[PDB]
Structure 1
Amino acid sequence: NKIQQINDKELQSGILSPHQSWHNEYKDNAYIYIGNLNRELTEGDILTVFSEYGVPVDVILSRDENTGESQGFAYLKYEDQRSTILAVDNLNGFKIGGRALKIDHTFYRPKRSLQKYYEAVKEELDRD
């Protein structure tokens, strides 16, 4: 896990400031990439693990257009962008149901074929 190696070397250099961090590049990005998921975990199951580090306002699990089953990666946006640093360097390499997940910062591009999916997601997270 390369992200977990560069946080150890950053922490030993005594950097500890977010603006001197390698995280600083992604200060405008509130989305995260989540990868190497187990196939049984779902959208409401992703919001449960990742709510430890903040309030997730959008979520997208990517799953095939034919068979409708999980490709094994998702996307999640937090209300506060500093929750992104939390999730990235504190939940990375965490074994969940056999496999260790990979979290990275990201720029998310929404698509047209998942449009009404985005309101089937939004009406859950508009409740809270």
Structure 2
Amino acid sequence: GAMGNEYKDNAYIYIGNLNRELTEGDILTVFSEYGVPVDVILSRDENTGESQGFAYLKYEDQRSTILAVDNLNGFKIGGRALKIDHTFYRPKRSLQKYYEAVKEELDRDIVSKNNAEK
């Protein structure tokens, strides 16, 4: 019940009820099984930088997103299970480097290159 049904462009998924020690890479570890995340963001505080217990992940393919919403939902991680829903929010401009720094690590695999830079 955290869906943003305003679109069907909801490649972003709400990952709620996460534990504190769960980081972006962790989320990627479980979610990459269901596809390739092109964007992922862990909702973490701007001061201390600690997880709020929420995340947003976006697969390349929204159908992969759907499979995660269902089949990865209810996976127990450290006493609590994670929740997936179709959320859509506009990425923050203030914290943009967090977003782009994340996709860089993902894009590494996504971009097929014989030559990366000229």
Deviations 1:76-103 (A, max 9, x none): 1111110111011112122111101111
CA distance in 2, matches of 1:92, 1:127: 27
Runs of 4+ in structure 1 off by over 3 angstroms are: 24-27
Larger radius of gyration: 1
Give the % identical residues.
100
Q: Deviations over 1:22-70 (max 9, x none)?
A: xx98642211000111100111111110011111110001111221111
Judging by fraction of residues, say which structure has more helix: 1
DSSP-derived class of the 1:126 partner:
helix
Superposition RMSD in Å: 1.7
CA distance in 1, matches of 2:9, 2:49: 32
Q: Would the aligned equivalents of 1:26 and 1:105 in 2 still touch at CA under 8 Å? A: no
* Equivalenced residues, count: 105
Structure 1: where are the runs of 5+ without partners?
A: 1-23
Q: Which structure would you say has the larger RCO, counting Cα contacts within 8 Å and 6 or more residues apart?
A: 2
CA distance in 2, matches of 1:89, 1:122: 24
